[PDB]
Amino acid sequence: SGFRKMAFPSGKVEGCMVQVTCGTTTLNGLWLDDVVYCPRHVICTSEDMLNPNYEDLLIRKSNHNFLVQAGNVQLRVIGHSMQNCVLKLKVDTANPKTPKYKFVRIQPGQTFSVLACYNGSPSGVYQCAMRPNFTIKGSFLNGSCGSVGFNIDYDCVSFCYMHHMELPTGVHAGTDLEGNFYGPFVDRKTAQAAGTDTTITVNVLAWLYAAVINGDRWFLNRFTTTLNDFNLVAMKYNYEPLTQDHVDILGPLSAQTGIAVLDMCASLKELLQNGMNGRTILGSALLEDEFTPFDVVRQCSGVTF
Amino acid sequence: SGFRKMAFPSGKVEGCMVQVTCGTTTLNGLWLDDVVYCPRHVICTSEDMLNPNYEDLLIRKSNHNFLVQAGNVQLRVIGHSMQNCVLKLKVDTANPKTPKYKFVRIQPGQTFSVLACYNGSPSGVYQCAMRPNFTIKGSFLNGSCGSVGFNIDYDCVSFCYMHHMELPTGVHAGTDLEGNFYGPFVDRKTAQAAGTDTTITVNVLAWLYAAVINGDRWFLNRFTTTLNDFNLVAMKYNYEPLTQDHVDILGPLSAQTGIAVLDMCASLKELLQNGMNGRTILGSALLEDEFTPFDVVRQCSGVTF
Ligand SMILES: *C(=N)[C@H](C[C@@H]1CCNC1=O)NC(=O)[C@@H]1[C@@H]2[C@H](CN1C(=O)[C@@H](NC(=O)C(F)(F)F)C(C)(C)C)C2(C)C
Numbered sequence: 001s002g003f004r005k006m007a008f009p010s011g012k013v014e015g016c017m018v019q020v021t022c023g024t025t026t027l028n029g030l031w032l033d034d035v036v037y038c039p040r041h042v043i044c045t046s047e048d049m050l051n052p053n054y055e056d057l058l059i060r061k062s063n064h065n066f067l068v069q070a071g072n073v074q075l076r077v078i079g080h081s082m083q084n085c086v087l088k089l090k091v092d093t094a095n096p097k098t099p100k101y102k103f104v105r106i107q108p109g110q111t112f113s114v115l116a117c118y119n120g121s122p123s124g125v126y127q128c129a130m131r132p133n134f135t136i137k138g139s140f141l142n143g144s145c146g147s148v149g150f151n152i153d154y155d156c157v158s159f160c161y162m163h164h165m166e167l168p169t170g171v172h173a174g175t176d177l178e179g180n181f182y183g184p185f186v187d188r189k190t191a192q193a194a195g196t197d198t199t200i201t202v203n204v205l206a207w208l209y210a211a212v213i214n215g216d217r218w219f220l221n222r223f224t225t226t227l228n229d230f231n232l233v234a235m236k237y238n239y240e241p242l243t244q245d246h247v248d249i250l251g252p253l254s255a256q257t258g259i260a261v262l263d264m265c266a267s268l269k270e271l272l273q274n275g276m277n278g279r280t281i282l283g284s285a286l287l288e289d290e291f292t293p294f295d296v297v298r299q300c301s302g303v304t305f
Numbered sequence: 306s307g308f309r310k311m312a313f314p315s316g317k318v319e320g321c322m323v324q325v326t327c328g329t330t331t332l333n334g335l336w337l338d339d340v341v342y343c344p345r346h347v348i349c350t351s352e353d354m355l356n357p358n359y360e361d362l363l364i365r366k367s368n369h370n371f372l373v374q375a376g377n378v379q380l381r382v383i384g385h386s387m388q389n390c391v392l393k394l395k396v397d398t399a400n401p402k403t404p405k406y407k408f409v410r411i412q413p414g415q416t417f418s419v420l421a422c423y424n425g426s427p428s429g430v431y432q433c434a435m436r437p438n439f440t441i442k443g444s445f446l447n448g449s450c451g452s453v454g455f456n457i458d459y460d461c462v463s464f465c466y467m468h469h470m471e472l473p474t475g476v477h478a479g480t481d482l483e484g485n486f487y488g489p490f491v492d493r494k495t496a497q498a499a500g501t502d503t504t505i506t507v508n509v510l511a512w513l514y515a516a517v518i519n520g521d522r523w524f525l526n527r528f529t530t531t532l533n534d535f536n537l538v539a540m541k542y543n544y545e546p547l548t549q550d551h552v553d554i555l556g557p558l559s560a561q562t563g564i565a566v567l568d569m570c571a572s573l574k575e576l577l578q579n580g581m582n583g584r585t586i587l588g589s590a591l592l593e594d595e596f597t598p599f600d601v602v603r604q605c606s607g608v609t610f
């Protein structure tokens with residue numbers, strides 16, 4: 001028993017992190033086979049970042065201008081190209097620690113582990129949700145760019161995020177590993193705003209299932225609802241619409257607990273209308289939306305890698 | 306910016322986890338050089354666990370009765386002994402992935418990363434505090450025993466916890482790597498109770514410093530207090546006494562923010578007496594006590610390994 005925010009074990013990603021330096025600018029890169037992937041703003045001076053022309057900056061760079069270090073070892077750069085907002089540095093050495101991997105673009109509402117890194121060295125691991133406004137609530141300082149987000153499925157690392165920048169209210173924005181931003185953000189040092197987030201309804205329901213599995217059952221009521229009536233009532237509390245796809249992915253938790261999804265929706269409706277009356281759910285005084293249905297099943301049935 | 310519950314990168318510990326099976330019973334072991342350390346209840350049938358005589362069970366075991374697997378590879382057991390509540394299995398192969406390591410006994414109020422494991426395979430990593438009642442709020446299922454807790458200091462893994470059991474209200478108990486329990490618990494399947502926990506005052510103060518560093522400052526008042534008056538007022542809220550040792554370890558955060566420790570204590574006194582008046586601190590509606598002063602500094606200044 002017990003329910004904790006849990007990250008994937010980071011080892012498979014730790015063996016892929018390198019340091020990339022171009023002139024004055026240093027950040028992290030991800031070394032897979034004989035390619036290093038890193039944020040393209042490595043080629044920028046702090047002045048260039050205010051209004052960069054990356055194509056123009058990159059013409060005036062050579063292979064040798066990129067210093068790539070795997071611990072103490074320099075990796076020789078033998079080619080370079082830009083794909084959207086990421087640089088690809090071909091190196092003369094394949095990373096012997098390359099795991100089986102895929103690049104995936106995650107959907108809003110889905111979670112991943114972040115391995116926060118500085119100077120090519122891992123510092124910490126935590127779990128994030130891709131918010132509906134295409135930001136993450138991370139923890140990143142100067143030098144963190146090129147830190148990656150990932151999921152692990154048995155032996156296979158699905159890389160989904162590379163860190164680029166911090167917005168107002170300390171939230172974070174970045175790209176997939178093809179260099180395409182999540183959300184309407186650009187890699188330019190100019191004021192940008194996230195704009196309005198929403199509560200991930202399916203994840204709140206997943207976490208209420210987690211709570212029941214752990215013996216927290218006070219919020220279960222005797223009622224059901226229609227999907228229609230639930231979505232009508234929940235809209236005013238800035239909850240995203242619950243779709244039949246969402247109901248389908250809750251099926252395993254519904255089946256395991258013998259609580260129909262629309263019965264749990266009736267309990268959620270009462271929490272939204274009445275509040276928690278000074279009670280906690282899994283130790284929290286607020287409804288939690290950063291656990292997916294898969295996150296609940298994996299932890300409350302012990303999947304390994 | 307941003308402040309997240311963050312675990313140490315797990316790779317150095319992932320390369321030490323093996324599966325140990327004795328007859329019918331399987332759990333995890335930690336392979337360092339040519340020794341495997343695991344909970345001694347691996348030698349028990351479920352019936353033996355009700356009232357075990359471990360010394361008697363172990364006499365009737367041979368080296369070959371211990372099946373140790375590192376992924377697919379069986380490690381030959383060439384010797385065995387019991388130290389308190391852990392078994393030590395000497396194997397014929399030194400673990401080539403053994404990190405620099407130490408065994409440490411952690412103090413109540415200190416944190417560590419847990420690598421939850423099943424069948425010798427890592428599943429997840431999370432952060433725990435050793436509670437003042439010598440339990441941890443973990444997430445552990447059947448087969449999790451032998452999962453370890455640790456801290457990483459540059460290259461050096463300090464192992465501090467090995468998992469043995471689950472108590473009432475889903476809290477967890479275990480040993481140091483010399484097999485000595487934290488708290489008054491025994492490895493016997495009979496009802497045992499944790500008894501009353503306390504709030505780790507120095508960690509609540511560390512987290513209020515984290516909040517200020519992140520721009521959450523509404524709770525800062527114009528007052529100071531004496532250590533004496535603070536401890537008198539806080540006692541009724543089941544906060545542990547704040548000692549001069551605790552004030553000393555807050556010094557770096559105090560120095561960094563320019564907020565004296567007793568000024569923050571005056572702010573904490575007002576939160577305890579008045580509540581949060583419907584406000585949050587770093588997104589929480591409750592005061593958080595599972596971040597050490599070191600945890601705040603490391604995250605809010607980016608230490609790597
Ligand atoms: C990469 N190492 C950093 C990561 C930042 C630093 C503080 N916390 C983080 O997550 N990335 C940057 O410094 C990027 C980089 C120029 C400016 N920048 C920003 O993150 C800035 N934010 C923005 O410009 C904004 F608002 F648009 F998001 C900053 C004010 C420094 C936080 C580039 C090329 C975008």
Ligand SMILES: *C(=N)[C@H](C[C@@H]1CCNC1=O)NC(=O)[C@@H]1[C@@H]2[C@H](CN1C(=O)[C@@H](NC(=O)C(F)(F)F)C(C)(C)C)C2(C)C
Nearest residue numbers: 346445446448449450469470471472492493494495497
């Ligand atoms: C090791 N793999 C498990 C870990 C447990 C299983 C459920 N969650 C956990 O953390 N350890 C055990 O099963 C130990 C083991 C016998 C019984 N046991 C317990 O954890 C039990 N608890 C207690 O006996 C109590 F209350 F004293 F802590 C159980 C009821 C199964 C949770 C031994 C030898 C103690």
